[PDB]
Amino acid sequence: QLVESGGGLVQPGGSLRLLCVASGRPFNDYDMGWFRQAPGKEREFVASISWSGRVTDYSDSMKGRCTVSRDNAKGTMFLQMSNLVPRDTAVYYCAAARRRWTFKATNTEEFYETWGQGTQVTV
Amino acid sequence: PVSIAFIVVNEFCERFSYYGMKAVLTLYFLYFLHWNEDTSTSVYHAFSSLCYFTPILGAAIADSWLGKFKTIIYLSLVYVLGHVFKSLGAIPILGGKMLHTILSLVGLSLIALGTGGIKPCVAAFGGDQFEEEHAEARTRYFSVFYLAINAGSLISTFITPMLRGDVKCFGQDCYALAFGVPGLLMVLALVVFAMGSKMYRKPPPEGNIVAQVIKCIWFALCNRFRNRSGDLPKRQHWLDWAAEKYPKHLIADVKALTRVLFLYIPLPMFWALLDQQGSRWTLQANKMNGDLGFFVLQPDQMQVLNPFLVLIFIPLFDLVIYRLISKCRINFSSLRKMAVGMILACLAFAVAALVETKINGMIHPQPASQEIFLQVLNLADGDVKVTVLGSRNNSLLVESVSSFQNTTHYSKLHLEAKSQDLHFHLKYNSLSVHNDHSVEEKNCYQLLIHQDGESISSMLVKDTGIKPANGMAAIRFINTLHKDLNISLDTDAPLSVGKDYGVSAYRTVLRGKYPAVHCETEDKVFSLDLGQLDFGTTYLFVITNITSQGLQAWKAEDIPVNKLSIAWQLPQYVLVTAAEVMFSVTGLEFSYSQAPSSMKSVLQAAWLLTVAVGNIIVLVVAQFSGLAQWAEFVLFSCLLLVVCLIFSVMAYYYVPLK
Numbered sequence: 138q139l140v141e142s143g144g145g146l147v148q149p150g151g152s153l154r155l156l157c158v159a160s161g162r163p164f165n166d167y168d169m170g171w172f173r174q175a176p177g178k179e180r181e182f183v184a185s186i187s188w189s190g191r192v193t194d195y196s197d198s199m200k201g202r203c204t205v206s207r208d209n210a211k212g213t214m215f216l217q218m219s220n221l222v223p224r225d226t227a228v229y230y231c232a233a234a235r236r237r238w239t240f241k242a243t244n245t246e247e248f249y250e251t252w253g254q255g256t257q258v259t260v
Numbered sequence: 261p262v263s264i265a266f267i268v269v270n271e272f273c274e275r276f277s278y279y280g281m282k283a284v285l286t287l288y289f290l291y292f293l294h295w296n297e298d299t300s301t302s303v304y305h306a307f308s309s310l311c312y313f314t315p316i317l318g319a320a321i322a323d324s325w326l327g328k329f330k331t332i333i334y335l336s337l338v339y340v341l342g343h344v345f346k347s348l349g350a351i352p353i354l355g356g357k358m359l360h361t362i363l364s365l366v367g368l369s370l371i372a373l374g375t376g377g378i379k380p381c382v383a384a385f386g387g388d389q390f391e392e393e394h395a396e397a398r399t400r401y402f403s404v405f406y407l408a409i410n411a412g413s414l415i416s417t418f419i420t421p422m423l424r425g426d427v428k429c430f431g432q433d434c435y436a437l438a439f440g441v442p443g444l445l446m447v448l449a450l451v452v453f454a455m456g457s458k459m460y461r462k463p464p465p466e467g468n469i470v471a472q473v474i475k476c477i478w479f480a481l482c483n484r485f486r487n488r489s490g491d492l493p494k495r496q497h498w499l500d501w502a503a504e505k506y507p508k509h510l511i512a513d514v515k516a517l518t519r520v521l522f523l524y525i526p527l528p529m530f531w532a533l534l535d536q537q538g539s540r541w542t543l544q545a546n547k548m549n550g551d552l553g554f555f556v557l558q559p560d561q562m563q564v565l566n567p568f569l570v571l572i573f574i575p576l577f578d579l580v581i582y583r584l585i586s587k588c589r590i591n592f593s594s595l596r597k598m599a600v601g602m603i604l605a606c607l608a609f610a611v612a613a614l615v616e617t618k619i620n621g622m623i624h625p626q627p628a629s630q631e632i633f634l635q636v637l638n639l640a641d642g643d644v645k646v647t648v649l650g651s652r653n654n655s656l657l658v659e660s661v662s663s664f665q666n667t668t669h670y671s672k673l674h675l676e677a678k679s680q681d682l683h684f685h686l687k688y689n690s691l692s693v694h695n696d697h698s699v700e701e702k703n704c705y706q707l708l709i710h711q712d713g714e715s716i717s718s719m720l721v722k723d724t725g726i727k728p729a730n731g732m733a734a735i736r737f738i739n740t741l742h743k744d745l746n747i748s749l750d751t752d753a754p755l756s757v758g759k760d761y762g763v764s765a766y767r768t769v770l771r772g773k774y775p776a777v778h779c780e781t782e783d784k785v786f787s788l789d790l791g792q793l794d795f796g797t798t799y800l801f802v803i804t805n806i807t808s809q810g811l812q813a814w815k816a817e818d819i820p821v822n823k824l825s826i827a828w829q830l831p832q833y834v835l836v837t838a839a840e841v842m843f844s845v846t847g848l849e850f851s852y853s854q855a856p857s858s859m860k861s862v863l864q865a866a867w868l869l870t871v872a873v874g875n876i877i878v879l880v881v882a883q884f885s886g887l888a889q890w891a892e893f894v895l896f897s898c899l900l901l902v903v904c905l906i907f908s909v910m911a912y913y914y915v916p917l918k
Contacts, residue, residue: 152785154778168296187297192290204776204787208751217776217787238302240361242294 138162140231140253147221147260152201155216155256157231164212165189170249171205171216172230182244183229184216188236194244200225221260230255261394264401266456267386268408273449274336275412277442278375280420281346282308284438287424292350292435293361303368305879310372312872318377319384319865320470327465328381328388328861329457335381336450339374342367343443350436352429380864387852388463388860395853402849403578406841407571414567466858473859476506476514513856516917520854520863523914524870526906531874532881533900534605537836538563541612541829544889547619547731547771547795550826557826565830569837577841594850595911601842602904606897608835613893615828620730620890622796622820625670627702635670636661636707637816639740639804640688640716644709647685650676661709666815675701688716706800706816708738710761719761723798723818726766733771733795737764738802743782745803749774749790757803771795779803788813796820854917 139160144153159167171183184195186205193205201220207213214231232252241248285307289300322331349363383405390398423441427434480502484493494501499518503511545559585592627633636646638661648657657673681696686709697720699705704723709716721738728734739745739757748754749769757764771794776787790813793799798818805811847867855863887895 148784152787154780154785189297192297194291194294211751215778217778219787236298237296238299239296240293240299241296242357243296244294248296 138233138251140233140251142229142231142254142256144216144229144256144258147258149221149223149260151221152217152219153221153258155218155229155231155258157214157216157253159212159233164207165209166236168234168236168243168249169205169207169214170232170234170243172232172246172249172252172255173225173227174230174255175225175227180246181227182246185243186214187243196244198225221258223260226259228255229258261389261397261401263389263456263459263461264386264404266452266459267382267389268404270449270453271382271405272408272412273452274339274375274378274446275409276416277343277446277449278371279413279416280423280442281343281371281439283416283420284424284435288350288364288435288438291433293357293364307368307372309872309876309879310369311376312875313869314373314376315380315865315868315872317373319380319861321377322381322384322861323465323859324468324470325465327462328385329460329462331381332378332385333450333454335374335377336446336453338370339378340443340447340450342370342372342374343439343446345370347436347439347443350429350439352432352436376868380861380868383848384852384861384864385460389461398853399845399849400578402852403574403845406845406848407574410567410570410574414564414571417564417567463857463860469859470862472506472510473514473517476502476510477518479505510858513858516854516856517859517862519914520851521866523910524866526903526910527870528873528877529903530602530605530900530907531871532877533609533896533903534836534840535874535878536882536896537609537612540889540892541832544612544616544619545826545829548826548829549823552826559826562826562829565833566837569833570841573837573841574845577838578845593916594846594853595914597846598843598850599904599908599911601839601846602900602907603839604835604842605839606900606904608832608839609893609897609900611832611835613890613897615824615832616890616893619824622822624725624727624796624798624818625821626725627704630675630701632673632675632699632701633670633704634673634707635667635705635816636709637667637800637802637814638663638665638709639802639814640709640711642689644716645685645687646707646709647687648673649683649685650680653683653685656680656682664814666817668817668819670819675699684718686716686718689714691715693717704818708761708802710740721763721800724766726798728768728796728798731771731795732768733793733797733799734766734768735793735799735801736766738762738800739764740802740804741781745779745781747777747779747803749777766798769793786811791815796823856917 141158141160143156147153155171165188168188170185173181173183175181182196184193184199184203184205186193186207189209190207195203200218200222203219204217206215216229230252232249234249234251239248286300286304289295289304290297318331318335322328326334345363346367349360349367383402386401386405387398390401420438424435424438427437429436480494480499483501486493492501497515499511499515542559542562545562550557550559625633634648634657636659638644641663643663644661646657646659646661650656656675657671659671679698679700681698684695684697686693693715695718697718699720699722704725706721706723708719708721710719726734735749737747737755737757739759739762742759744759745757746754747757750767753767755764755767773792774790777790779786779788788803788811790801797820800816802814802816803811804814848864851863851867852860
């Protein structure tokens with residue numbers, strides 16, 4: 138709970154690593170996901186890593202290449218874009234959701250309950 | 261018994277579909293319905309458990325109502341409907357997130373209800389085709405039945421990867437075909453079965469057996485209970501006075517059922533213990549060599565060797581070994597066979613424990629006096645000529661090293677004195693370069709051949725033999741960039757390196773495959789394909805930023821000498837598959853041949869529920885894992901041995917049906 142975020146400006150073809158720590162509760166019990174929000178009227182799912190990081194899923198775009206990972210120790214999640222282009226200049230949101238039994242989709246802005254602030258990655 | 265033709269090709273074609281739709285089920289749940297991981301695993305395990313427990317709802321509805329071959333047809337029809345409601349629930353066009361979920365769940369439910377109730381009844385029906393006078397040929401039929409089951413499994417393993425990858429069903433990834441093909445083949449099996457309606461020997465059911473059995477056992481557990489009276493509660497057995505009603509021709513049948521049930525008590529533990537090899541043995545295979553010189557075999561693929569051994573030993577056993585036993589008075593009563601199968605299973609897990617204890621003995625080759633381990637890596641664009649020499653151009657090493665590659669070999673450079681200022685002779689691009697790197701004896705050294713523009717130079721790196729902890733590896737890095745890097749494989753400490761051919765310090769990271777690692781320079785962030793990292797192996801990585809090919813890391817490995825190959829695991833596969841074949845086939849035949857004619861399939865139901873309770877024990881135990889592999893295998897061997905003794909004692913007193 139009380140999630141955070143870190144990342145920044147890029148060259149037209151570089152890459153980044155996005156960081157998201159959990160600040161108030163054991164990060165093990167939290168399913169985790171990545172969102173973006175372009176300066177328009179959208180809210181796009183980006184990538185999703187499951188509990189224990191065993192199962193990961195990336196959006197259809199998954200700009201260039203992306204890789205999500207989490208270490209339940211220190212409670213932090215890593216996003217690594219590869220081929221950032223002058224698109225996807227957005228406000229990348231970090232989202233969390235407790236391990237429940239639900240049939241809601243893992244790639245929607247419905248399953249996650251407590252997304253915190255977002256970075257302002259530009260390109 | 262010609263009519264068994266349409267009994268084995270049906271089991272083959274429906275086990276094929278079931279195993280095909282099982283493998284893709286988890287991928288479908290995760291990547292199509294986009295479900296939470298715990299929900300997906302929970303529903304998958306629930307579906308498997310339902311498949312395993314439903315056979316009672318098949319065997320009872322076979323041996324009480326509607327008979328059988330009229331339960332096979334009328335339940336495989338529901339099975340077909342379930343596959344239709346599955347393959348229809350994978351359509352990515354109509355509906356969304358509610359239709360796709362409702363159809364999928366109804367499909368799982370109906371498919372489970374079908375399989376758990378086709379599985380026992382089909383074997384029972386196949387048995388009924390024979391005559392009691394030809395009691396021997398039934399054994400070969402059950403052997404062929406198990407052969408067909410595992411052949412179906414094998415073909416499903418080889419052919420389902422060719423279905424779920426890179427197809428379009430409608431605008432997205434294609435899961436309908438991955439479900440349609442199993443459904444289509446299974447409904448084409450339902451037509452090969454029905455062709456034999458003019459050929460079978462359909463036995464009518466004799467009565468409301470399950471009702472009769474339940475009523476009889478309830479009345480049995482009423483007569484002995486003579487609270488404030490009594491002179492003869494139930495004498496000489498525990499049913500013999502559940503006989504004033506329920507004529508005796510049934511009481512013998514329920515006696516036989518109770519005796520076989522009491523015999524099947526210990527078996528579920530065995531099914532759990534034998535099951536816990538599909539994953540732990542793969543973990544064992546993860547920690548050993550697999551190239552084999554002919555085909556590099558991934559540890560995951562090792563699993564498929566299990567059904568293959570069944571296909572190769574069933575005709576081996578039933579046509580060679582069983583006869584060779586019959587050469588003398590050795591009297592396998594189809595119970596000694598199951599006991600010896602249990603014994604071989606225990607021996608197999610003991611051999612697995614021995615293999616574990618041998619794997620943990622890896623050491624990389626230690627040096628004796630006048631011995632230094634060298635390993636040269638080349639990074640010149642062309643090909644280089646490597647020579648190491650002594651005082652006067654005196655031979656120590658000659659070797660032709662090619663261009664950019666990896667390396668794992670070494671060479672025991674027989675040094676000559678307490679320390680020899682090695683004269684290196686490198687020739688490259690028709691250039692003569694000779695430098696001296698003073699070295700100490702009984703250590704490990706490495707060279708880097710690097711493009712110094714037109715010419716080249718030799719960099720010497722001295723390894724400190726810091727061994728990593730068990731089941732974990734150590735790495736160090738060489739940098740070739742103009743800026744200091746930071747390559748943080750591990751969680752906390754950001755490892756650092758130096759510019760212009762610097763050296764890192766050893767870092768001890770968990771063994772496994774690392775596809776991308778954070779690497780932040782002064783300006784740019786990137787990642788590299790480190791690939792697989794076996795444990796007990798010291799890796800050295802050189803990071804290059806060559807103009808043409810960009811950022812790439814050139815591997816360089818140490819090695820444990822006594823790394824056992826992916827072989828030396830066949831022996832435990834051999835001893836476990838021999839146990840499986842001697843146990844499953846004999847159990848099927850024993851269940852059918854020690855069952856009263858009126859309830860020939862409830863015994864198959866009992867056997868299947870034995871397997872099912874074994875699976876439930878697997879599920880409950882698997883979460884409580886905190887033990888080392890070798891201790892785990894020795895415990896699974898001791899427990900299996902005590903279960904074998906319990907079963908042997910409880911079988912030595914089992915009176916047979918007659």
